[PDB]
Design a protein around this ligand. Structure first.
Ligand code: CL
Ligand code: CL
Length: 164
């Protein structure tokens, strides 16, 4: 299992513009288009992202391209962030994916806000970090996905994504 498979499972894949769990226009593999309520704004953002008139729909290849760009961005965002870099650097390969997963979902800014959880992860206090991570709007809003990510941080294994 790797970051791409992991996120593909958590985000799904849709070739038509859709609304994410928060009601924001998104497409492909969880690629956020805009927070604006205007479907036209979203279509414009899409065309701009793809480089053609899409009229709201894209190909699988195009979704995958956005996806690669998105993962690179999340990773790069983590590496540029002073609060994040140290944690990411301290983690094993599996747990790094869990951190990437969070950033892809909520942005580096959001993640950098889990101050207490980050310190516990840095300290390798897995059970403690797990409980702290659960005391969040994130967990309460998208519980099944948060559970998967949290288990991953707790165990350092892919068990939560096995049999999905
Ligand atoms: Cl809470
Ligand atoms: Cl969920």
């Amino acid at each position: 299992m790797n970051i791409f498979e992991m996120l593909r499972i958590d985000e799904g894949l849709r070739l038509k513009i859709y609304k994410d769990t928060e009601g924001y226009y998104t497409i492909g593999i969880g690629h956020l288009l805009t927070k604006s309520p205007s479907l036209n704004a979203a279509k414009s953002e899409l065309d701009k992202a793809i480089g053609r008139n899409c009229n709201g729909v894209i190909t699988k290849d195009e979704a995958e391209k956005l996806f690669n760009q998105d993962v690179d961005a999340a990773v790069r965002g983590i590496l540029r962030n002073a609060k994040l870099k140290p944690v990411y650097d301290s983690l094993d390969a599996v747990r790094q994916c869990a951190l990437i997963n969070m950033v892809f979902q909520m942005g580096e800014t959001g993640v950098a806000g889990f101050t207490n959880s980050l310190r516990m992860l840095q300290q390798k206090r897995w059970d403690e970090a797990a409980v702290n991570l659960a005391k969040s709007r994130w967990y309460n809003q998208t519980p099944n996905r948060a559970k998967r990510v949290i288990t991953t941080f707790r165990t350092g294994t892919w068990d939560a994504y096995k049999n999905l």
